[PDB]
Amino acid sequence: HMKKVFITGICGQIGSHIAELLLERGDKVVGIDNFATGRREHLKDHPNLTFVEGSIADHALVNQLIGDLQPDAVVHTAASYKDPDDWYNDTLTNCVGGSNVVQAAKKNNVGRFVYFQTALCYGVKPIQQPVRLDHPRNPANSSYAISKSANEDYLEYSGLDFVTFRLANVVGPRNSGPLPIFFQRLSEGKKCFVTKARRDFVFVKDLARATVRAVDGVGHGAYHFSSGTDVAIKELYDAVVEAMALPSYPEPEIRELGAPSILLDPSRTIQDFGKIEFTPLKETVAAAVAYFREYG
Amino acid sequence: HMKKVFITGICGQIGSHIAELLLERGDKVVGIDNFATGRREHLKDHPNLTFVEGSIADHALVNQLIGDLQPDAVVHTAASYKDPDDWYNDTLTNCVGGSNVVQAAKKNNVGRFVYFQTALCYGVKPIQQPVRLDHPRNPANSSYAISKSANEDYLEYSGLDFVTFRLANVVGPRNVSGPLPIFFQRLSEGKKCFVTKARRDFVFVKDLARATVRAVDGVGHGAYHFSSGTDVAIKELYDAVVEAMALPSYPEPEIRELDDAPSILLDPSRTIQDFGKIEFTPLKETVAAAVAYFREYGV
Ligand SMILES: NC(=O)c1ccc[n+]([C@@H]2O[C@H](COP(=O)([O-])OP(=O)(O)OC[C@H]3O[C@@H](n4cnc5c(N)ncnc54)[C@H](O)[C@@H]3O)[C@@H](O)[C@H]2O)c1
Ligand SMILES: NC(=O)c1ccc[n+]([C@@H]2O[C@H](COP(=O)([O-])OP(=O)(O)OC[C@H]3O[C@@H](n4cnc5c(N)ncnc54)[C@H](O)[C@@H]3O)[C@@H](O)[C@H]2O)c1
């Protein structure tokens, strides 16, 4: 049967990709986005899609939309982050908007809630390697992590049946971060710093299809959505130059560290979501780069 | 001879008592209150006082008030809490409003920032007794604790020279929340009161206000448990109220059983280290002061 799904931040990387999967299998999708960072083009028209331009900080709007629709699931991807000095929109969107969305879902007995969270909730340098789901919380390292983490608090407090995907880095088409930086600089002929660190990168499309399973009732609570492996920043850079189809090899500026590696332990995710086949790094980066070429 | 101090929640229990201390010594005080819980009558007029009705959620107002004053210090007492289901105001006041206040202070190079935090940052049933300052943070037990602790996080993150007083319960005149105003009202209406079999810390607002002035003046850095390190049974608080009201006979309370800890002590050690050995006002004196306020101002 046709599910009803409310998606916040539906014109963003993660939300638009989820929206596409749901719409293609016949679900009814209602979405909200204010275009802080998302783009209208990310979300193609579909007869079962309703799009509302607005902010999740708008309490009456969020309640009206969820109240009317009575969704089977809320997928909450909306987040403010782009300017680290903009504490105002970070709190207004992630705290006021985030609790608005959580409480509306709880008020309307929404059966499933999917949230997305930064691994910065554990601090910038974890005390566990790999980081386990019981790593102490240390979110006061940025406006983004602090506010994102207060939104998670409200979700855990609400009593909703939820799934939170805690993520290192999500990359692909529609994506900020190292990928667009690398692409942008190499396009301008600029030399890139490549630090001697390993980090975890996850294709948005792997995450989108694990979300559909969460919408369908797979999983409860917080998970590390990770392969359990990490990649060197050099390997990421190399993948970007490879997809860019350069007459080059431009040797980067190797830069010493100033954590060396952040592995997220995926044991609970393997347990409940099964052994997932994660898209290979080159293919993930190829898709991200084809998107940059076409848009920016 | 005249510090400039900006107070948020200036018409509340804690803010107004701090304003009074600063004004009587010759300081210049500017304050803001939306009357979500406090009262205009809590803040008496004074030549060196400027009062502004408004919300700290208003980014432009906060930045204009602090921007125009260039305070030596910000005392941030404003908080939303009174309706546990009102997540919107809690996050708009505590998170948006609270981050506004912290960031405006930092942008304006404010030398000292004093904040007030709930010991619910630690959870409802702590795993240390006495609770130490390194106790794990478990704030996801109420809208109040979650949004207060986000505000605390921004303060820590800002780079400001701050003191946070972490508190159990603050009581005395102008206390509008918690058991004390409820005991007074129900006792004066002849209604049955409920006493839980639990022990909690209660601190006289005026002790806290005098420590805040020291903190404004440069005493302490970081987080502290503002506490004697003792606690009292709720039954003792109730009995102190009956005796302060001089009721002609003792009204037997209804005893509730205690999820939650039987007793929460906060370790005062770092407070003694940096603020010295504070003579805490005894409960009897604290409750008599509160009862005197409730008889004049009502609940
Ligand atoms: N590396 C990553 O991209 C990554 C890693 C960890 C966590 N996450 C989380 O995943 C979620 C989505 O991430 P993304 O990569 O798709 O980011 P994104 O910027 O592509 O999408 C977020 C969307 O939210 C919208 N939005 C912002 N404020 C809004 C508001 N007040 N009301 C309505 N819409 C608003 C934006 O315009 C944007 O479309 C976020 O919660 C983010 O914190 C992402
Ligand atoms: N009172 C306690 O037992 C206790 C215990 C732990 C922590 N604290 C903290 O101490 C601080 C002060 O507590 P109190 O006992 O003085 O409470 P209070 O309610 O008397 O004071 C809070 C004041 O802030 C004002 N306020 C609320 N939202 C505002 C907004 N958006 N803009 C401007 N003003 C606003 C209220 O009207 C009120 O006057 C609060 O931050 C509280 O969380 C108090």
XYZ file of C-alpha atoms and ligand atoms in Angstrom:
683
model
C 0.000 0.000 0.000
C 0.794 3.697 -0.801
C 2.515 5.304 2.195
C 2.245 8.968 3.157
C 5.650 10.544 3.905
C 6.474 14.100 5.085
C 10.054 15.117 4.204
C 11.756 18.192 5.642
C 14.534 19.705 3.575
C 13.212 17.899 0.502
C 15.314 19.935 -2.006
C 18.547 18.961 -0.241
C 21.010 16.208 -1.131
C 19.610 13.537 1.170
C 15.923 14.598 1.135
C 15.555 14.898 -2.682
C 17.142 11.459 -3.162
C 14.798 9.909 -0.606
C 11.813 11.717 -2.217
C 12.712 10.185 -5.610
C 12.830 6.610 -4.224
C 9.472 6.992 -2.430
C 7.725 8.665 -5.364
C 8.895 6.077 -7.879
C 7.383 3.199 -5.792
C 4.003 5.008 -5.581
C 4.048 6.756 -2.199
C 2.435 10.103 -1.452
C 5.174 12.674 -0.573
C 4.690 16.101 0.992
C 7.820 18.221 1.346
C 8.987 21.507 2.868
C 12.152 23.517 2.098
C 13.127 27.202 2.486
C 16.106 27.043 0.093
C 18.781 27.945 2.647
C 21.064 25.532 0.750
C 18.788 23.284 -1.333
C 17.721 23.942 -4.961
C 14.325 23.740 -6.682
C 15.953 21.682 -9.497
C 16.871 18.938 -7.067
C 13.169 18.049 -6.857
C 11.446 17.055 -10.112
C 7.607 17.413 -10.378
C 5.549 14.236 -9.817
C 1.734 13.814 -9.468
C 2.126 12.368 -5.964
C 4.454 15.174 -4.760
C 3.251 18.210 -2.862
C 5.913 20.872 -2.288
C 5.532 23.779 0.165
C 8.093 26.542 0.276
C 8.610 27.522 3.902
C 10.556 27.120 7.130
C 10.245 24.328 9.699
C 10.688 27.090 12.339
C 7.109 28.054 11.297
C 5.250 26.103 14.065
C 1.718 26.560 12.582
C 2.827 25.557 9.057
C 4.642 22.354 10.256
C 1.636 21.372 12.401
C -0.857 22.125 9.639
C 1.058 20.032 7.095
C 1.599 17.005 9.406
C -1.858 17.298 10.970
C -3.671 17.244 7.595
C -1.544 14.530 5.965
C -1.353 12.170 8.950
C 1.874 10.700 7.469
C 3.080 7.130 8.004
C 6.618 8.582 8.391
C 8.438 11.902 8.763
C 11.897 12.053 7.181
C 13.623 15.031 8.831
C 16.669 16.188 6.782
C 16.270 20.010 7.096
C 19.242 21.679 8.742
C 21.031 25.007 8.955
C 24.842 24.832 8.867
C 26.421 26.779 5.971
C 27.720 29.720 8.048
C 29.352 28.641 11.356
C 28.845 32.184 12.709
C 25.125 32.093 11.998
C 24.053 30.692 15.359
C 20.701 32.338 14.829
C 19.505 30.292 11.872
C 21.238 27.209 13.251
C 19.140 27.445 16.512
C 16.015 28.663 14.749
C 16.114 25.808 12.177
C 17.725 22.934 14.110
C 16.344 23.682 17.566
C 13.040 25.515 17.079
C 12.346 23.948 13.671
C 13.710 20.537 14.744
C 11.644 20.324 17.906
C 8.644 21.709 15.941
C 8.945 18.711 13.585
C 9.559 16.124 16.314
C 6.591 17.361 18.444
C 4.179 17.547 15.501
C 5.129 13.980 14.587
C 4.538 12.874 18.160
C 1.249 14.852 18.454
C -0.072 13.172 15.292
C 1.015 9.641 16.350
C 3.356 9.363 13.392
C 4.488 5.745 13.364
C 8.050 6.209 11.987
C 10.510 9.135 12.223
C 13.897 9.202 10.386
C 16.558 11.678 11.487
C 20.119 12.382 10.242
C 22.876 13.384 12.607
C 26.523 14.419 12.391
C 29.213 12.270 14.106
C 30.462 15.582 15.535
C 27.975 14.764 18.319
C 30.967 12.735 19.618
C 33.410 15.690 19.428
C 36.089 16.413 16.837
C 38.604 13.880 18.207
C 36.798 10.733 19.553
C 38.202 8.692 22.527
C 37.172 5.423 20.834
C 38.504 3.857 17.643
C 36.251 2.710 16.056
C 33.590 4.960 17.633
C 30.886 2.905 19.321
C 27.225 3.951 19.808
C 27.985 4.419 23.506
C 30.822 7.011 22.913
C 30.265 9.936 25.310
C 28.514 12.951 23.764
C 30.780 15.957 23.169
C 28.782 18.224 20.802
C 30.068 21.695 21.865
C 32.613 21.964 19.061
C 30.453 24.002 16.644
C 27.085 25.771 16.284
C 26.155 23.009 13.821
C 26.909 20.046 16.135
C 25.415 21.770 19.216
C 22.106 22.576 17.548
C 21.937 19.269 15.631
C 22.546 17.487 18.883
C 19.747 19.370 20.760
C 17.401 18.282 17.931
C 18.520 14.653 18.557
C 17.830 15.126 22.272
C 14.214 16.144 21.620
C 13.774 13.127 19.324
C 15.069 10.710 21.949
C 12.888 12.459 24.604
C 9.729 12.409 22.418
C 8.938 8.673 22.687
C 8.499 8.450 18.905
C 9.658 5.236 17.246
C 12.588 6.676 15.350
C 15.721 5.807 13.450
C 18.699 8.187 13.554
C 21.497 7.728 11.031
C 24.678 9.176 12.534
C 26.985 10.010 9.647
C 30.582 11.115 9.020
C 30.272 12.574 5.500
C 27.623 12.097 2.848
C 28.735 12.686 -0.732
C 27.194 12.474 -4.221
C 25.211 14.657 -6.538
C 23.465 17.622 -4.849
C 26.246 17.808 -2.158
C 29.506 21.406 0.693
C 32.714 19.656 1.993
C 35.997 18.381 0.384
C 34.478 17.062 -2.910
C 33.069 20.389 -4.144
C 36.186 22.167 -2.736
C 38.522 19.860 -4.666
C 36.423 20.159 -7.821
C 36.124 23.920 -7.529
C 39.861 24.540 -6.945
C 41.019 22.106 -9.669
C 38.634 23.837 -12.090
C 40.237 27.186 -11.293
C 43.669 25.556 -11.714
C 44.401 25.974 -7.973
C 46.729 23.638 -6.054
C 45.030 21.629 -3.283
C 46.036 20.783 0.259
C 45.594 17.089 0.960
C 45.946 16.292 4.620
C 47.290 12.968 5.900
C 44.062 11.746 7.539
C 41.463 9.067 6.915
C 37.729 9.800 7.069
C 34.482 8.020 6.296
C 32.487 8.890 3.131
C 29.064 7.488 2.303
C 27.151 7.737 -1.017
C 23.857 9.617 -0.645
C 22.095 6.918 -2.680
C 23.118 4.105 -0.287
C 21.763 6.218 2.567
C 18.506 7.002 0.661
C 17.660 3.364 0.160
C 18.492 2.490 3.780
C 16.082 5.343 4.725
C 13.236 3.801 2.655
C 13.807 0.602 4.678
C 13.699 2.673 7.874
C 10.407 4.275 6.637
C 9.124 0.661 6.158
C 9.957 -0.233 9.751
C 13.582 -1.523 9.698
C 15.635 -0.405 12.739
C 14.935 1.445 15.988
C 17.121 4.140 17.547
C 20.611 5.388 16.648
C 22.866 3.721 14.068
C 26.219 4.516 12.487
C 25.511 4.496 8.840
C 28.976 3.547 7.684
C 30.812 0.733 5.886
C 33.012 0.601 8.952
C 35.991 1.539 6.789
C 37.597 4.908 6.132
C 39.331 6.561 3.214
C 42.491 8.696 3.016
C 41.864 12.284 1.880
C 44.450 11.589 -0.847
C 42.191 8.779 -2.176
C 39.245 11.172 -2.255
C 41.313 13.775 -4.049
C 42.573 11.107 -6.518
C 38.968 10.040 -7.283
C 38.009 13.668 -7.961
C 40.898 14.201 -10.386
C 40.114 10.852 -12.100
C 36.443 11.760 -12.730
C 37.328 15.276 -13.802
C 39.097 13.700 -16.769
C 42.111 15.945 -16.492
C 45.060 16.183 -18.949
C 47.012 16.488 -15.738
C 47.724 14.571 -12.767
C 48.061 17.642 -10.527
C 50.223 16.564 -7.567
C 48.672 18.116 -4.401
C 50.368 19.631 -1.351
C 50.569 16.805 1.229
C 49.929 18.376 4.635
C 50.691 16.893 8.092
C 47.923 16.397 10.692
C 47.083 19.121 13.231
C 42.260 12.503 14.876
C 44.338 10.628 12.207
C 41.431 8.264 11.497
C 37.752 8.292 12.443
C 36.155 4.891 11.988
C 32.482 4.567 12.914
C 31.624 1.056 14.250
C 28.787 -0.267 12.046
C 28.108 -3.462 14.098
C 24.540 -2.481 15.067
C 23.772 -1.386 11.506
C 24.975 -4.705 10.087
C 22.902 -6.439 12.756
C 19.583 -4.735 11.880
C 19.974 -3.557 8.234
C 22.029 -6.566 7.149
C 25.282 -6.646 5.202
C 24.859 -3.642 2.857
C 26.832 -3.354 -0.381
C 28.207 0.180 -0.329
C 28.856 1.874 -3.657
C 32.613 2.017 -4.520
C 34.374 5.368 -3.921
C 35.161 6.043 -7.585
C 31.518 5.630 -8.622
C 30.295 7.831 -5.728
C 32.772 10.549 -6.799
C 31.971 10.149 -10.497
C 28.302 10.862 -9.753
C 29.194 13.898 -7.580
C 31.483 15.322 -10.334
C 28.934 14.807 -13.156
C 26.540 16.843 -11.005
C 29.127 19.671 -10.542
C 29.819 19.793 -14.339
C 26.085 20.105 -15.043
C 25.201 22.585 -12.271
C 27.878 24.000 -9.959
C 33.501 53.070 40.092
C 30.617 52.194 37.661
C 30.551 48.871 35.839
C 28.082 48.406 33.004
C 26.074 45.205 33.338
C 23.426 43.784 30.992
C 20.886 41.435 32.704
C 18.494 39.097 30.855
C 15.379 37.980 32.720
C 15.878 40.971 34.991
C 12.339 40.811 36.475
C 12.823 37.150 37.598
C 13.793 35.759 40.975
C 17.539 35.616 40.374
C 17.962 38.524 37.885
C 16.156 41.155 39.990
C 18.122 40.366 43.176
C 21.368 40.628 41.187
C 20.167 44.014 39.692
C 19.522 45.370 43.179
C 23.008 44.479 44.432
C 24.658 46.094 41.370
C 22.547 49.253 41.525
C 23.064 49.902 45.250
C 26.822 49.828 44.797
C 26.790 52.393 41.966
C 26.802 50.191 38.814
C 24.891 50.932 35.629
C 22.354 48.226 34.808
C 20.427 47.611 31.592
C 17.922 44.724 31.657
C 15.401 42.876 29.464
C 12.320 40.815 30.406
C 9.242 39.530 28.477
C 7.244 38.721 31.627
C 6.858 35.059 30.644
C 7.285 34.338 34.386
C 8.749 37.371 36.170
C 6.899 40.527 37.233
C 7.466 44.245 36.751
C 7.101 44.780 40.524
C 10.233 42.643 41.103
C 12.367 45.420 39.666
C 12.231 48.685 41.545
C 13.114 51.902 39.777
C 16.583 53.383 40.039
C 18.490 56.275 38.414
C 21.146 53.883 37.047
C 18.645 51.346 35.764
C 17.360 51.095 32.210
C 14.535 48.564 31.747
C 13.448 47.195 28.348
C 10.393 44.958 27.805
C 11.207 42.468 25.097
C 12.361 38.970 24.203
C 15.993 37.787 23.994
C 14.780 35.757 20.998
C 14.838 39.096 19.108
C 18.333 38.991 17.585
C 18.320 42.694 16.564
C 17.125 43.985 19.967
C 19.771 42.013 21.887
C 22.551 43.148 19.606
C 21.357 46.799 19.854
C 21.045 46.706 23.731
C 24.488 45.081 24.264
C 25.982 46.954 21.264
C 24.820 50.323 22.660
C 25.931 49.624 26.278
C 29.259 47.856 25.744
C 28.799 46.013 29.064
C 31.650 44.941 31.306
C 29.465 41.921 32.015
C 26.400 39.987 30.883
C 24.301 38.168 33.498
C 22.106 35.731 31.583
C 19.168 34.572 33.751
C 16.359 34.590 31.129
C 14.871 31.102 30.527
C 11.672 29.520 29.285
C 10.485 26.487 31.345
C 6.953 26.906 32.797
C 5.052 24.602 30.391
C 6.894 21.276 29.745
C 5.014 20.749 26.528
C 5.928 24.194 25.225
C 9.019 23.102 23.233
C 8.640 26.058 20.952
C 9.187 28.786 23.566
C 11.829 26.733 25.389
C 13.884 26.449 22.223
C 13.076 30.020 21.022
C 14.073 31.518 24.408
C 16.777 29.058 25.590
C 18.337 28.160 22.245
C 17.686 31.088 19.841
C 17.436 33.698 22.632
C 20.240 32.055 24.589
C 22.671 31.799 21.644
C 21.735 35.469 20.728
C 22.881 36.641 24.162
C 26.096 34.616 24.129
C 27.070 35.668 20.609
C 26.283 39.400 21.147
C 28.397 39.374 24.286
C 31.320 37.781 22.348
C 30.948 40.181 19.361
C 31.112 43.102 21.815
C 34.162 41.849 23.727
C 32.200 41.567 26.999
C 34.773 40.708 29.720
C 32.596 38.540 31.998
C 29.487 36.364 31.310
C 27.501 34.741 34.153
C 25.055 31.929 33.335
C 22.655 29.783 35.438
C 22.117 26.171 34.616
C 19.939 23.336 35.931
C 21.589 20.268 37.543
C 19.155 18.285 35.303
C 21.994 18.561 32.731
C 23.203 15.446 34.676
C 19.974 13.466 34.333
C 17.137 12.696 36.777
C 19.058 9.894 38.534
C 22.825 10.629 38.600
C 25.494 7.877 38.835
C 27.687 9.794 41.304
C 26.821 10.833 44.851
C 27.851 13.552 45.478
C 27.532 14.673 41.817
C 30.859 15.990 40.516
C 31.493 18.460 37.720
C 32.812 15.647 35.507
C 29.547 13.723 35.715
C 28.350 12.584 32.275
C 25.825 14.898 30.624
C 22.377 13.350 30.210
C 20.137 16.370 29.387
C 17.419 14.606 27.312
C 14.932 14.276 30.166
C 12.784 17.392 29.610
C 12.407 20.254 27.174
C 13.811 22.532 29.887
C 17.030 20.510 30.444
C 17.670 19.895 26.717
C 17.278 23.626 25.759
C 19.132 24.974 28.865
C 22.059 22.641 28.088
C 22.230 23.687 24.410
C 22.547 27.258 25.675
C 25.313 26.093 28.023
C 27.097 24.385 25.074
C 27.162 27.740 23.069
C 28.633 29.516 26.103
C 31.427 26.957 26.433
C 31.965 27.051 22.668
C 31.996 30.917 22.416
C 35.461 31.548 23.944
C 33.924 33.976 26.534
C 35.312 34.314 30.063
C 32.286 32.864 31.807
C 31.102 31.454 35.134
C 28.190 28.992 35.060
C 26.378 28.346 38.324
C 24.827 24.855 38.123
C 21.962 24.650 40.533
C 19.417 22.301 42.075
C 16.733 24.675 43.416
C 16.874 28.442 44.069
C 14.181 29.753 46.460
C 13.265 32.848 48.447
C 11.370 36.034 47.583
C 10.259 36.185 43.919
C 10.428 32.389 43.509
C 7.488 31.644 41.210
C 8.168 27.956 40.498
C 8.548 24.665 42.297
C 7.098 23.432 45.617
C 7.553 26.529 47.732
C 4.950 28.840 46.150
C 2.610 25.799 45.882
C 2.914 24.966 49.578
C 2.191 28.599 50.508
C -0.884 28.931 48.277
C -2.411 25.530 49.153
C -1.712 26.060 52.884
C -3.346 29.475 52.866
C -6.371 27.968 51.013
C -6.605 25.039 53.471
C -5.874 22.497 50.705
C -3.940 19.256 51.105
C -0.231 19.431 50.145
C 1.915 16.563 48.895
C 5.335 15.754 50.205
C 7.569 13.382 48.291
C 9.974 11.192 50.231
C 13.040 12.742 48.594
C 15.939 15.015 49.517
C 16.954 17.976 47.317
C 19.239 21.004 47.573
C 17.644 24.447 48.096
C 19.750 27.623 47.896
C 18.607 31.107 49.029
C 18.408 33.433 46.023
C 20.373 36.142 47.911
C 23.428 33.859 48.495
C 23.446 33.168 44.735
C 23.124 36.908 43.936
C 26.123 37.854 46.127
C 28.232 35.123 44.422
C 27.173 36.449 41.032
C 28.479 39.932 41.893
C 31.845 38.329 42.825
C 31.704 36.481 39.458
C 30.947 39.758 37.656
C 33.999 41.165 39.412
C 36.299 38.442 38.062
C 35.922 35.604 40.603
C 35.872 32.078 39.119
C 36.115 30.598 35.623
C 33.899 27.848 34.124
C 31.225 25.685 35.762
C 30.497 25.391 39.525
C 27.847 23.759 41.668
C 26.394 26.583 43.596
C 25.607 24.558 46.704
C 26.397 23.976 50.368
C 26.876 20.296 49.377
C 23.960 19.283 51.666
C 20.289 18.544 50.806
C 16.955 18.693 52.623
C 13.961 16.348 52.639
C 10.885 17.895 50.976
C 9.137 17.268 54.348
C 11.624 19.682 55.973
C 10.841 22.364 53.330
C 7.067 21.849 53.943
C 7.518 22.038 57.711
C 9.589 25.205 57.376
C 6.663 26.723 55.406
C 4.023 25.694 58.024
C 6.205 27.225 60.795
C 6.912 30.415 58.784
C 3.156 30.923 58.247
C 2.538 30.201 61.994
C -0.534 28.105 61.183
C -2.465 27.380 64.378
C -2.217 23.602 64.039
C -0.045 21.319 61.909
C -1.680 20.282 58.575
C -0.549 16.697 57.920
C 0.786 16.451 54.341
C 0.105 13.537 52.046
C 3.335 11.511 51.729
C 4.191 10.357 48.183
C 6.738 7.626 47.484
C 9.697 8.270 45.205
C 12.972 6.560 38.187
C 14.448 9.405 40.351
C 17.220 9.527 42.955
C 16.248 9.526 46.694
C 18.895 12.177 47.303
C 20.947 14.447 45.058
C 24.008 16.140 46.506
C 26.170 18.358 44.384
C 29.899 18.335 45.189
C 30.748 21.917 46.259
C 34.523 21.312 46.370
C 35.546 23.518 43.389
C 33.194 26.242 44.689
C 34.948 26.254 48.061
C 38.327 26.233 46.182
C 37.558 29.413 44.086
C 34.785 31.297 45.973
C 35.851 30.321 49.523
C 33.701 28.987 52.322
C 30.323 30.648 51.822
C 28.009 31.021 54.794
C 24.750 29.748 53.310
C 21.550 31.249 54.718
C 19.695 28.583 56.772
C 16.422 27.152 55.438
C 14.285 28.762 58.128
C 15.496 32.249 57.191
C 15.113 31.515 53.440
C 11.544 30.242 53.814
C 10.522 33.096 56.114
C 11.791 35.568 53.458
C 9.821 33.742 50.730
C 6.616 33.577 52.853
C 6.943 37.289 53.556
C 7.111 37.868 49.769
C 4.118 35.616 48.997
C 2.013 37.455 51.664
C 2.748 40.819 49.958
C 2.944 39.901 46.268
C 0.708 36.815 46.071
C 1.608 33.732 44.040
N 28.021 15.196 4.973
C 26.711 15.408 5.049
O 25.986 16.008 3.984
C 25.987 14.987 6.304
C 26.702 14.394 7.368
C 26.076 14.227 8.600
C 24.755 14.649 8.790
N 24.066 15.205 7.740
C 22.666 15.628 7.969
O 21.762 15.210 6.927
C 20.745 16.234 6.722
C 20.618 16.772 5.293
O 21.938 16.919 4.842
P 22.290 17.244 3.319
O 23.702 16.788 3.071
O 21.217 16.696 2.464
O 22.284 18.869 3.397
P 21.531 19.844 2.358
O 22.045 21.211 2.596
O 21.807 19.397 0.986
O 19.991 19.754 2.795
C 19.380 20.368 3.914
C 18.115 20.983 3.359
O 17.379 21.620 4.367
C 16.830 22.835 3.857
N 16.533 23.751 4.993
C 17.433 24.486 5.734
N 16.730 25.158 6.660
C 15.398 24.932 6.514
C 14.268 25.374 7.198
N 14.318 26.207 8.264
N 13.062 24.891 6.787
C 12.906 24.035 5.712
N 14.046 23.600 5.044
C 15.264 24.045 5.450
C 17.949 23.379 2.998
O 17.522 24.425 2.118
C 18.430 22.100 2.351
O 17.669 21.851 1.207
C 21.108 17.364 7.662
O 20.335 17.181 8.832
C 22.572 17.159 8.000
O 22.902 17.692 9.271
C 24.671 15.377 6.508
N 14.975 28.872 40.120
C 15.613 27.712 40.217
O 15.241 26.753 41.167
C 16.759 27.408 39.291
C 17.414 26.167 39.324
C 18.355 25.887 38.322
C 18.616 26.820 37.297
N 17.943 28.019 37.282
C 18.148 28.999 36.181
O 18.211 30.300 36.682
C 17.704 31.274 35.774
C 16.727 32.170 36.488
O 15.817 31.395 37.237
P 14.771 32.139 38.222
O 14.555 31.284 39.416
O 15.259 33.514 38.413
O 13.422 32.008 37.348
P 12.382 33.176 36.922
O 11.302 32.572 36.126
O 11.927 33.975 38.072
O 13.236 34.146 35.937
C 13.367 33.959 34.536
C 13.060 35.353 33.991
O 13.352 35.397 32.592
C 12.271 35.992 31.901
N 12.209 35.471 30.541
C 11.741 34.238 30.113
N 11.871 34.203 28.762
C 12.392 35.400 28.334
C 12.715 35.923 27.065
N 12.470 35.272 25.909
N 13.243 37.189 27.032
C 13.440 38.000 28.150
N 13.122 37.476 29.384
C 12.625 36.198 29.462
C 11.044 35.624 32.725
O 9.916 36.444 32.535
C 11.594 35.708 34.148
O 11.464 36.991 34.674
C 17.005 30.500 34.699
O 17.889 30.459 33.627
C 16.901 29.105 35.294
O 16.845 28.138 34.269
C 17.016 28.297 38.264
